[PDB]
Amino acid sequence: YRKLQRELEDATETADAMNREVSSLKNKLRRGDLPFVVPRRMA
Amino acid sequence: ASPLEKALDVMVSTFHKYSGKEGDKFKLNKSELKELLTRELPSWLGKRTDEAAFQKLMSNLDSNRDNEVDFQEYCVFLSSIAMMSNEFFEGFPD
Amino acid sequence: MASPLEKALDVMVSTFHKYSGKEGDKFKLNKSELKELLTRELPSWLGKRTDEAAFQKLMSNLDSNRDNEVDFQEYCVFLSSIAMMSNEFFEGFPDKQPRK
Ligand SMILES: [Ca+2]
Ligand SMILES: [Ca+2]
Ligand SMILES: [Ca+2]
Ligand SMILES: [Ca+2]
């Protein structure tokens, strides 16, 4: 385990911005805006 | 399947090992998140037990303000950890 | 000692650097390096367009800070989106769906 307190808390202080970025990208993939990549898991 | 493909599947399986124990089947409550962290990410536990810090972690991760950590929020958690591991990987050349 | 999830996080980091360190900025993926990483390490996730224009569109949308590179954080945003697709497949099944 770590040698300090709070490193996970420190590392997640901007989780909101990252969630908003992930939401944006996931939406583009889902909608077929980036057809180099699949919109859904496939075999 | 490549190691990276398998790794992404471990992210999914590990989430569901805990998310279905209580309440919402597809989200982690505080108790479930605590179990996941303690049992699957013990390398990231703080030096001292610290409930206040854990509460703050939960609050930080709950970006949509629903008192749960869903799969996306959990991916952001894991990304945040990976980013620290990456800082270590890059930051200490010999 | 390390759990499968701890090992998985190490694979996220190691795989990135296998490609990022080939050319130029050794800690970011240029177009060529990203393309190799995707084609070699995420082949199950490649869609129906394989042309360079489609690839450029992907690169552009992963490169949120427009420095013509995909850094580690930008790469994690992409991996998270892929994991979410797998999760949506997983959650489509009945709770006691058999597995190994
Ligand atoms: Ca739950
Ligand atoms: Ca939430
Ligand atoms: Ca590079
Ligand atoms: Ca960039």
Numbering used by the authors:
A (entry chain Q): 1893 to 1935
B (entry chain A): 2 to 95
C (entry chain B): 1 to 100
Give verbatim lines from the article:
It has a hydrophobic stem (Phe-89, 90 and 93, Pro-94) and a tip populated by bulky basic residues (Lys-96, 100 and 101, Arg-99). In two crystal structures of Ca2+-bound peptide-free S100A4 the hydrophobic cleft of each subunit is occupied by the hydrophobic stem of the C-terminus of an adjacent dimer, which may explain the formation of S100A4 oligomers that were observed extracellularly. Since the ITC measurements did not reveal the true affinity of MPT to S100A4, we also performed fluorescence polarization measurements. Nevertheless the dynamic Ca2+-activated elongated random-coil at C-terminus of S100A4 may be important for interacting with native NMIIA filaments.
S100A4 (also known as mts1, metastasin, calvasculin, p9Ka) has been strongly associated with increased metastasis properties in several animal models. The interaction of S100A4 to different binding partners (for example p53, annexin A2, CD16, non-muscle myosin II) is mediated by Ca2+-induced conformational changes. It has been widely recognized that the conformational change upon Ca2+-binding opens up a hydrophobic cleft on the protein surface.
